[PDB]
Amino acid sequence: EAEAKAKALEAQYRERERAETEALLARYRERAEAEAKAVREKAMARLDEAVALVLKEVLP
Amino acid sequence: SKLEAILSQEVEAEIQALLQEAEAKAEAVKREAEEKAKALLQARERALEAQYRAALRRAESA
């Protein structure tokens, strides 16, 4: 009984480890892509509105 | 035969004491190994559960 329950615990919860790790990690890749494209969208429209300010400051 | 029939009944009392020790040994071994069965159950469960939990913590943190 000790060996049977030990092997059952080890195998089943090892595959539980792998499944839960993968299931959480995939949505972490999802958040990575989401954050990257969201800051791209925030970046791509607000260009050239401040480069006239930095050219006002650089040129004497 | 009276007095060595009493000696042979002392012998049956030795049989009685031996079966007392037999039942006592069976119950003692079963009890101590039951304690160890439950203790090793909980030991390997909580150990691999803590390893699983710490792997989940460090995985989501990374």
XYZ file of N, CA, C and O in Angstrom, unseen atoms left out:
487
model
N 0.824 -1.212 0.000
C 0.000 0.000 0.000
C 0.856 1.259 0.000
O 0.527 2.232 -0.694
N 1.957 1.247 0.764
C 2.863 2.392 0.806
C 3.471 2.664 -0.564
O 3.439 3.803 -1.050
N 3.968 1.614 -1.229
C 4.589 1.790 -2.541
C 3.563 2.181 -3.602
O 3.852 3.024 -4.464
N 2.354 1.605 -3.535
C 1.322 1.888 -4.530
C 0.831 3.326 -4.431
O 0.751 4.036 -5.443
N 0.511 3.777 -3.215
C 0.070 5.151 -3.040
C 1.195 6.142 -3.300
O 0.934 7.241 -3.809
N 2.446 5.762 -3.002
C 3.580 6.633 -3.286
C 3.755 6.842 -4.785
O 3.883 7.983 -5.250
N 3.737 5.750 -5.557
C 3.855 5.857 -7.007
C 2.667 6.593 -7.622
O 2.851 7.377 -8.565
N 1.460 6.380 -7.077
C 0.267 7.070 -7.566
C 0.376 8.575 -7.371
O 0.147 9.351 -8.310
N 0.747 8.991 -6.151
C 0.963 10.399 -5.832
C 2.016 11.013 -6.744
O 1.775 12.060 -7.361
N 3.165 10.335 -6.889
C 4.285 10.885 -7.652
C 3.934 11.071 -9.123
O 4.073 12.176 -9.660
N 3.406 10.021 -9.766
C 3.085 10.094 -11.191
C 1.961 11.090 -11.467
O 2.099 11.973 -12.332
N 0.851 10.983 -10.718
C -0.318 11.800 -11.016
C -0.062 13.270 -10.728
O -0.414 14.137 -11.537
N 0.602 13.578 -9.620
C 0.817 14.977 -9.319
C 2.035 15.545 -10.034
O 2.122 16.767 -10.181
N 2.919 14.694 -10.573
C 3.935 15.170 -11.506
C 3.309 15.616 -12.824
O 3.663 16.676 -13.371
N 2.355 14.835 -13.339
C 1.679 15.273 -14.556
C 0.740 16.448 -14.280
O 0.541 17.302 -15.156
N 0.205 16.535 -13.057
C -0.550 17.717 -12.641
C 0.327 18.964 -12.619
O -0.112 20.046 -13.037
N 1.553 18.828 -12.097
C 2.567 19.877 -12.149
C 2.792 20.379 -13.566
O 2.730 21.590 -13.824
N 3.049 19.449 -14.492
C 3.313 19.827 -15.883
C 2.111 20.517 -16.526
O 2.264 21.556 -17.189
N 0.906 19.986 -16.287
C -0.299 20.544 -16.894
C -0.601 21.945 -16.367
O -0.893 22.860 -17.148
N -0.502 22.141 -15.046
C -0.815 23.448 -14.469
C 0.237 24.490 -14.830
O -0.105 25.653 -15.101
N 1.515 24.084 -14.848
C 2.591 24.977 -15.264
C 2.385 25.455 -16.696
O 2.477 26.659 -16.978
N 2.042 24.527 -17.603
C 1.813 24.897 -18.997
C 0.582 25.783 -19.152
O 0.608 26.762 -19.915
N -0.488 25.476 -18.410
C -1.741 26.211 -18.561
C -1.617 27.646 -18.062
O -2.236 28.559 -18.623
N -0.818 27.867 -17.020
C -0.619 29.231 -16.540
C 0.378 29.987 -17.428
O 0.182 31.175 -17.755
N 1.424 29.282 -17.873
C 2.483 29.872 -18.678
C 1.995 30.329 -20.053
O 2.467 31.356 -20.559
N 1.031 29.613 -20.651
C 0.521 29.999 -21.970
C -0.227 31.331 -21.921
O -0.049 32.192 -22.797
N -1.045 31.534 -20.886
C -1.696 32.825 -20.693
C -0.692 33.910 -20.322
O -0.936 35.094 -20.590
N 0.447 33.532 -19.739
C 1.507 34.522 -19.551
C 2.114 34.972 -20.883
O 2.426 36.160 -21.055
N 2.263 34.048 -21.843
C 2.638 34.459 -23.204
C 1.575 35.361 -23.826
O 1.898 36.306 -24.567
N 0.303 35.064 -23.539
C -0.802 35.898 -24.013
C -0.704 37.324 -23.472
O -0.873 38.297 -24.222
N -0.411 37.463 -22.173
C -0.235 38.792 -21.590
C 0.983 39.497 -22.174
O 0.960 40.726 -22.323
N 2.047 38.746 -22.489
C 3.233 39.340 -23.108
C 2.894 39.985 -24.446
O 3.216 41.162 -24.683
N 2.202 39.234 -25.311
C 1.805 39.764 -26.616
C 0.834 40.936 -26.475
O 0.936 41.932 -27.211
N -0.079 40.853 -25.496
C -1.067 41.909 -25.284
C -0.413 43.213 -24.841
O -0.715 44.281 -25.387
N 0.492 43.137 -23.859
C 1.181 44.326 -23.363
C 2.063 44.947 -24.434
O 2.102 46.182 -24.571
N 2.758 44.105 -25.213
C 3.614 44.608 -26.285
C 2.810 45.371 -27.330
O 3.134 46.519 -27.653
N 1.715 44.779 -27.821
C 0.952 45.464 -28.860
C 0.181 46.663 -28.306
O -0.032 47.646 -29.028
N -0.187 46.632 -27.018
C -0.870 47.774 -26.414
C 0.052 48.979 -26.298
O -0.358 50.114 -26.585
N 1.308 48.759 -25.901
C 2.218 49.897 -25.842
C 2.675 50.310 -27.245
O 2.988 51.491 -27.453
N 2.639 49.400 -28.236
C 2.817 49.821 -29.631
C 1.700 50.757 -30.079
O 1.952 51.747 -30.776
N 0.457 50.439 -29.706
C -0.681 51.269 -30.096
C -0.642 52.619 -29.392
O -1.006 53.644 -29.981
N -0.215 52.637 -28.128
C -0.039 53.912 -27.441
C 1.116 54.712 -28.031
O 1.085 55.948 -28.017
N 2.131 54.029 -28.565
C 3.310 54.710 -29.080
C 3.093 55.290 -30.472
O 3.557 56.399 -30.760
N 2.397 54.558 -31.347
C 2.424 54.877 -32.772
C 1.623 56.123 -33.135
O 1.854 56.695 -34.206
N 0.698 56.559 -32.281
C -0.115 57.728 -32.596
C 0.444 59.014 -32.006
O 0.210 60.094 -32.562
N 1.188 58.923 -30.903
C 1.702 60.091 -30.202
C 3.100 60.480 -30.656
O 3.877 61.025 -29.861
N 3.445 60.208 -31.909
C 4.739 60.577 -32.459
C 4.645 61.945 -33.123
O 3.563 62.378 -33.532
N 5.784 62.655 -33.126
C 6.078 63.923 -33.801
C 5.410 65.119 -33.117
O 5.705 66.273 -33.440
N 4.558 64.862 -32.125
C 3.918 65.941 -31.385
C 4.858 66.578 -30.373
O 4.635 67.725 -29.972
N 5.907 65.867 -29.962
C 6.868 66.379 -28.997
C 8.256 66.591 -29.582
O 9.106 67.213 -28.922
N 8.514 66.102 -30.798
C 9.835 66.294 -31.373
C 10.027 67.747 -31.791
O 11.160 68.236 -31.821
N 8.940 68.485 -32.028
C 9.069 69.924 -32.211
C 9.451 70.616 -30.910
O 10.169 71.618 -30.934
N 9.027 70.069 -29.767
C 9.459 70.625 -28.489
C 10.937 70.353 -28.247
O 11.669 71.240 -27.781
N 11.399 69.136 -28.549
C 12.810 68.861 -28.298
C 13.693 69.602 -29.309
O 14.818 69.994 -28.982
N 13.181 69.891 -30.512
C 13.917 70.749 -31.435
C 13.857 72.219 -31.061
O 14.758 72.974 -31.437
N 12.807 72.646 -30.361
C 12.802 73.981 -29.781
C 13.853 74.098 -28.687
O 14.480 75.152 -28.529
N 14.057 73.027 -27.918
C 14.999 73.117 -26.807
C 16.450 72.949 -27.262
O 17.345 73.597 -26.709
N 16.705 72.104 -28.266
C 18.081 71.867 -28.708
C 18.639 73.087 -29.434
O 19.725 73.578 -29.102
N 17.912 73.593 -30.423
C 18.369 74.765 -31.166
C 18.305 76.007 -30.283
O 17.267 76.272 -29.669
N 19.389 76.789 -30.190
C 19.470 77.965 -29.320
C 18.586 79.111 -29.793
N -4.671 -38.414 36.361
C -3.524 -38.175 37.224
C -3.528 -36.724 37.705
O -3.394 -35.804 36.898
N -3.638 -36.549 39.028
C -4.048 -35.270 39.612
C -2.995 -34.182 39.441
O -3.230 -33.174 38.768
N -1.820 -34.370 40.037
C -0.896 -33.258 40.196
C -0.136 -32.965 38.913
O 0.128 -31.799 38.609
N 0.157 -33.974 38.105
C 0.714 -33.655 36.803
C -0.364 -33.357 35.765
O -0.043 -32.792 34.716
N -1.641 -33.631 36.063
C -2.712 -32.999 35.296
C -2.790 -31.508 35.599
O -3.091 -30.703 34.714
N -2.514 -31.124 36.846
C -2.421 -29.706 37.190
C -1.185 -29.082 36.545
O -1.218 -27.933 36.095
N -0.091 -29.839 36.459
C 1.088 -29.368 35.733
C 0.805 -29.210 34.240
O 1.247 -28.240 33.614
N 0.032 -30.125 33.656
C -0.368 -29.962 32.264
C -1.434 -28.883 32.084
O -1.582 -28.341 30.984
N -2.163 -28.523 33.139
C -3.058 -27.378 33.023
C -2.286 -26.071 33.156
O -2.667 -25.066 32.554
N -1.190 -26.078 33.922
C -0.217 -24.987 33.867
C 0.393 -24.875 32.476
O 0.691 -23.775 31.999
N 0.597 -26.015 31.818
C 1.037 -26.032 30.425
C -0.014 -25.402 29.507
O 0.314 -24.613 28.610
N -1.295 -25.723 29.721
C -2.346 -25.035 28.965
C -2.442 -23.553 29.315
O -2.835 -22.750 28.464
N -2.069 -23.171 30.536
C -1.956 -21.755 30.869
C -0.770 -21.112 30.160
O -0.802 -19.916 29.859
N 0.279 -21.888 29.883
C 1.370 -21.382 29.056
C 0.934 -21.219 27.606
O 1.357 -20.269 26.941
N 0.087 -22.131 27.114
C -0.551 -21.959 25.805
C -1.391 -20.687 25.791
O -1.383 -19.923 24.816
N -2.132 -20.457 26.881
C -2.946 -19.255 27.045
C -2.095 -17.992 27.014
O -2.422 -17.031 26.314
N -0.993 -17.985 27.769
C -0.088 -16.841 27.783
C 0.557 -16.630 26.419
O 0.758 -15.488 25.989
N 0.832 -17.720 25.700
C 1.455 -17.598 24.388
C 0.470 -17.047 23.361
O 0.857 -16.261 22.493
N -0.806 -17.432 23.445
C -1.783 -16.867 22.514
C -2.137 -15.427 22.882
O -2.459 -14.627 21.992
N -2.072 -15.088 24.177
C -2.131 -13.692 24.610
C -1.016 -12.872 23.978
O -1.261 -11.796 23.420
N 0.218 -13.381 24.044
C 1.350 -12.692 23.434
C 1.252 -12.681 21.914
O 1.716 -11.734 21.276
N 0.608 -13.693 21.328
C 0.412 -13.754 19.882
C -0.534 -12.656 19.403
O -0.204 -11.886 18.489
N -1.725 -12.587 20.009
C -2.677 -11.520 19.703
C -2.100 -10.142 20.019
O -2.293 -9.190 19.250
N -1.367 -10.028 21.135
C -0.756 -8.761 21.514
C 0.306 -8.331 20.511
O 0.399 -7.147 20.173
N 1.082 -9.285 19.991
C 2.105 -8.955 19.008
C 1.477 -8.550 17.681
O 1.951 -7.605 17.035
N 0.409 -9.248 17.265
C -0.277 -8.894 16.022
C -0.880 -7.497 16.099
O -0.719 -6.690 15.172
N -1.513 -7.172 17.232
C -2.105 -5.849 17.384
C -1.048 -4.763 17.537
O -1.229 -3.658 17.016
N 0.072 -5.068 18.202
C 1.137 -4.085 18.373
C 1.793 -3.743 17.043
O 1.981 -2.561 16.722
N 2.121 -4.768 16.246
C 2.740 -4.549 14.941
C 1.773 -3.842 13.995
O 2.168 -2.910 13.276
N 0.487 -4.227 14.021
C -0.501 -3.576 13.164
C -0.702 -2.116 13.548
O -0.812 -1.253 12.674
N -0.686 -1.813 14.848
C -0.871 -0.437 15.299
C 0.321 0.442 14.932
O 0.146 1.559 14.421
N 1.545 -0.046 15.177
C 2.723 0.776 14.900
C 2.936 0.944 13.397
O 3.298 2.034 12.929
N 2.620 -0.082 12.611
C 2.735 0.065 11.176
C 1.570 0.842 10.576
O 1.730 1.427 9.506
N 0.423 0.902 11.260
C -0.665 1.781 10.839
C -0.300 3.242 11.054
O -0.579 4.100 10.199
N 0.281 3.538 12.223
C 0.864 4.851 12.488
C 1.871 5.238 11.414
O 1.828 6.353 10.881
N 2.756 4.303 11.049
C 3.738 4.600 10.009
C 3.113 4.721 8.626
O 3.599 5.509 7.812
N 2.037 3.976 8.348
C 1.364 4.087 7.059
C 0.744 5.465 6.888
O 0.949 6.123 5.860
N 0.040 5.943 7.921
C -0.551 7.277 7.859
C 0.518 8.368 7.851
O 0.385 9.372 7.131
N 1.601 8.170 8.611
C 2.657 9.175 8.681
C 3.416 9.285 7.365
O 3.710 10.394 6.914
N 3.714 8.152 6.720
C 4.400 8.179 5.434
C 3.501 8.664 4.306
O 3.998 9.336 3.388
N 2.202 8.326 4.364
C 1.178 8.937 3.518
C 1.267 10.458 3.543
O 1.503 11.105 2.509
N 1.107 11.035 4.739
C 1.109 12.485 4.875
C 2.472 13.082 4.555
O 2.539 14.170 3.980
N 3.553 12.356 4.850
C 4.903 12.846 4.591
C 5.155 13.031 3.100
O 5.513 14.132 2.656
N 4.957 11.968 2.307
C 5.228 12.091 0.876
C 4.205 12.990 0.183
O 4.574 13.722 -0.753
N 2.956 13.018 0.682
C 1.952 13.928 0.131
C 2.345 15.382 0.330
O 2.383 16.156 -0.632
N 2.657 15.770 1.571
C 2.957 17.167 1.851
C 4.300 17.581 1.270
O 4.458 18.740 0.871
N 5.248 16.646 1.139
C 6.534 16.985 0.535
C 6.393 17.267 -0.958
O 6.846 18.314 -1.448
N 5.743 16.360 -1.700
C 5.598 16.615 -3.129
C 4.587 17.728 -3.390
O 4.699 18.435 -4.398
N 3.641 17.943 -2.468
C 2.720 19.066 -2.587
C 3.442 20.392 -2.396
O 3.146 21.364 -3.096
N 4.378 20.454 -1.445
C 5.150 21.674 -1.247
C 6.080 21.937 -2.423
O 6.280 23.096 -2.809
N 6.641 20.876 -3.015
C 7.479 21.057 -4.201
C 6.657 21.545 -5.389
O 7.078 22.457 -6.115
N 5.476 20.948 -5.590
C 4.521 21.407 -6.595
C 4.116 22.864 -6.380
O 4.095 23.655 -7.334
N 3.854 23.247 -5.127
C 3.425 24.607 -4.820
C 4.537 25.616 -5.082
O 4.303 26.658 -5.707
N 5.762 25.309 -4.637
C 6.888 26.212 -4.866
C 7.240 26.319 -6.346
O 7.652 27.395 -6.806
N 7.059 25.231 -7.106
C 7.253 25.300 -8.550
C 6.220 26.211 -9.200
O 6.556 26.977 -10.108
N 4.969 26.167 -8.722
C 3.940 27.058 -9.264
C 4.227 28.522 -8.936
O 4.068 29.395 -9.803
N 4.649 28.795 -7.694
C 5.045 30.145 -7.283
C 6.176 30.696 -8.142
O 6.075 31.803 -8.689
N 7.271 29.937 -8.269
C 8.411 30.450 -9.021
C 8.113 30.505 -10.516
O 8.638 31.385 -11.207
N 7.240 29.628 -11.020
C 6.874 29.665 -12.432
C 6.076 30.918 -12.766
O 6.375 31.609 -13.750
N 5.066 31.239 -11.947
C 4.297 32.450 -12.214
C 5.115 33.708 -11.950
O 4.946 34.716 -12.654
N 6.057 33.644 -11.004
C 6.918 34.787 -10.743
C 7.874 35.035 -11.902
O 8.080 36.186 -12.304
N 8.437 33.965 -12.474
C 9.344 34.118 -13.606
C 8.597 34.552 -14.860
O 9.124 35.336 -15.655
